[PDB]
Amino acid sequence: ALKTAVHEKIMNDVVLAVKKNAEWKVLIVDQLSMRMVSACCKMHEIMSEGITLVEDINRRREPLPLLEAVYLITPTEESVKCLMADFQNPDNPQYRGAHIFFTEACPEELFKELCKSTTARFIKTLKEINIAFLPYESQIFSLDSPDTFQVYYNPSRAQGGIPNKERCAEQIATLCATLGEYPSVRYRSDFDENASFAQLVQQKLDAYRADDPTMGEGPQKDRSQLLILDRGFDPISPLLHELTFQAMAYDLLPIENDVYKYEVLLDEKDDLWVEMRHQHIAVVSQNVTKKLKQFADEKRGIKDLSQMLKKMPQYQKELSKYSTHLHLAEDCMKQYQQHVDKLCKVEQDLAMGTDADGEKIRDHMRNIVPILLDQKISAYDKIRIILLYIIHKGGISEENLAKLVQHAHIPAEEKWIINDMQNLGVPIIQDGGRRKIPQPYHTHNRKERQADHTYQMSRWTPYMKDIMEAAVEDKLDTRHYPFLNGGGKSGPRLIIFVVGGISYSEMRSAYEVTQTAKNNWEVILGSTHILTPEGLLRDLRKISNP
């Protein structure tokens, strides 16, 4: 319920915590804290409890010496300056009093500064609420930290990147503290940089239980596990054109900051999107009526059409409840019948390694070339196919990489995106004169799954799900996913964090394993950021584009 745990901290420990009476108050937030508050709280909720206005701490505003101010912000250089600035000098008090709530631990550097500023006398509340992540969805959290990808995968960003990493480790710890968990930490051993990141996470959450022995109280919470994965654990999934509603929309359409214009925001506060989000596009429109008909039914050879008439108004009201969403599914389908259909057939063969009939694939170019030499198909779609093919083959010679990039007419700027995928541990350049890089994510290396798929264009299953299901049954190989400490109204909870981003299909998998393969287990998936196939391509981009 992650979204409510946050709701509980904001509402009771911030808003309500400061309410001693009915005096109006102003809520001051910063870019990040606002995003954080938006996800779990609907504006009319804060506003109904004494908060009369919401301002961005950065862009200064009209002074309100008569009202106290609630500062819910990130203890940043910026923010803290603006803070001390609002009370930078008496008789100008931006406000009459200040209730300060730091989103995360405050650097003692700034702490000292502030405590001696002329702001000290106006501070009526000073706390650390510890909420340094976005409760993106009731089971998915983001650290909105895509630069960490560069940190983890660009050698140039290597050392000197530790501050970023342990900051990540601290944000993850606040996530567990919010859930009141002290899970046993595990990490994928095959990517050497993980163990090191796991220690950071462990240290950070160790510091938290130090200040609270009830964190991880026995109630099944002693079985909770926090798995640290690296993006290279499965490079296929984030590259695939997925066809479930949510995953497909963000990939095919220009939905920025989650807003789909002609405009609407896709969030869990929509309650409808929550029911259609994981649905396969093949049935979104269908089901909209299978239920709308279920509505125009619960409200009830010669046939009398009276009622239906007396009740059309209420009907047209409902049909309108789906207006924009149908406009979304429609958009995805036009896009699909346009050029996606053809891409999925090749992608599914490459990702699976078998055709729709279960047979190993062969004569790869027979289908690759035609797409590569199609001038109407974007270079990013060709790059996704190139990579899926590289990955399928387990590495390619420089020669052929060359020939493929030639046929696809891929700019030289984008060309390095393929090559760079290698910094994640994926074998793309054949011999490499080194050793064999395992590909745990390939189907022929995973547990068997039924080869009877509802849709031929959707046979792939994220490797993530295999991991989730195995962990939920105490069957996750410790030889590949070891505990760094050896060993290993309730959960337990399986917290999976991927440094490098999570795809919408993996977020979908979190829900699937939770509401099915249960034993009261709850899978919470989090990451540095939310991935889009092109978004990933853009991230591989930034390690060679300066």
UniProtKB/TrEMBL annotation:
Signal peptide positions (record): none
Keywords of the record: Protein transport, Transport
GO biological process: one example: vesicle-mediated transport
Pfam families per the UniProt record, alphabetical: Sec1
Superkingdom: Eukaryota
The family this protein is said to belong to: Belongs to the STXBP/unc-18/SEC1 family.
Name of protein: Sec1-like protein
